Design a protein around this ligand. Structure first.
Ligand SMILES: C[C@H](CCC(=O)O)[C@H]1CC[C@H]2[C@@H]3[C@H](O)C[C@@H]4C[C@H](O)CC[C@]4(C)[C@H]3C[C@H](O)[C@]12C
Ligand SMILES: [Zn+2]
Length: 258
């Protein structure tokens, strides 16, 4: 509960408060592209974000979260491996102190500079709190970031970060369109897993896009100016807020594409 990403409270320590950390379907994992099985029965993903209603952006001490109004079916994910309708509740990123690390999932052991998680919950469970207690409660759409050209749809996020530098700060963040964070292709890998921070609950259908988005060095540098700490405290830069790959155990990663 004082968990974090430091030497003394980072991922190797989490199991002491959250024993599920050593569970059978933990995330992230390495995606071995040459052992993932193409599944021609997997449907295309349906990302319906046209009516998304963003509300606020919050530094929670672990990442920054863009929150959405999820009291109606406004922005939803369907199709792919999913049965039913999953409502977008928030997105956040994980990133590194250096461009060669920061992603949680890896691809043939390659780490990307960051990873975007769009978090959705299965509406058949009524609310998010109930959903997280179900093995099929959440669908997280994971998108890799590499450093290159700027991502124009990211800039509105980058520019508000100065206003939420420290833990517990929030800012109004309305009318943000998450479609601007998607790559061209929706080809994906999918497997059953978990939340990647405590409480580490095993309630996630992971959908990880094959195609990374590119962001500029200036954009990711701005992520790295955030703070894990609260206002006025000694500065601890919010960097390397990622959990490393966990054992795949008895799971197969499926690919939507050959
Ligand atoms: C811990 C997990 C993020 C794991 C990850 O880094 O991918 C996140 C994703 C969605 C989060 C939840 C949702 O955003 C809704 C709630 C937001 C509140 O600010 C905290 C509780 C709240 C219930 C969150 C708890 C926790 O931070 C959740 C469950
Ligand atoms: Zn995450």
């Amino acid at each position: 509960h004082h968990w974090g990403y430091g030497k003394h409270n980072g991922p190797e320590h989490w199991h002491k408060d959250f024993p599920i950390a050593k569970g059978e379907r933990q995330s992230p994992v390495d995606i071995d592209t040459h052992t993932a099985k193409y599944d021609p029965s997997l449907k295309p993903l349906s990302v319906s974000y046209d009516q998304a209603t963003s509300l606020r952006i919050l530094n929670n001490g672990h990442a920054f979260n863009v929150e959405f109004d999820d009291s109606q079916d406004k922005a939803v994910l369907k199709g792919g491996p999913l049965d039913g309708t999953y409502r977008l509740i928030q997105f956040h990123f994980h990133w590194g102190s250096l461009d060669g690390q920061g992603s949680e999932h890896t691809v043939d052991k390659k780490k990307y500079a960051a990873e975007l998680h769009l978090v959705h919950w299965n509406t058949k469970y009524g609310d998010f709190g109930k959903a997280v207690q179900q093995p099929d409660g959440l669908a997280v759409l994971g998108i890799f970031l590499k450093v290159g050209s700027a991502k124009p749809g990211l800039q509105k996020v980058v520019d508000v970060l100065d206003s939420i530098k420290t833990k517990g700060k929030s800012a109004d963040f309305t009318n943000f369109d998450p479609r601007g964070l998607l790559p061209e292709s929706l080809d994906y890998w999918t497997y059953p897993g978990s939340l990647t921070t405590p409480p580490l609950l095993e309630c996630v259908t992971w959908i990880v896009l094959k195609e990374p988005i590119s962001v500029s060095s200036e954009q990711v540098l701005k992520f790295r100016k955030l703070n894990f700490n609260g206002e006025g405290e000694p500065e601890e830069l919010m960097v390397d807020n990622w959990r490393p790959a966990q054992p795949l155990k008895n799971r197969q990663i499926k690919a939507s594409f050959k």
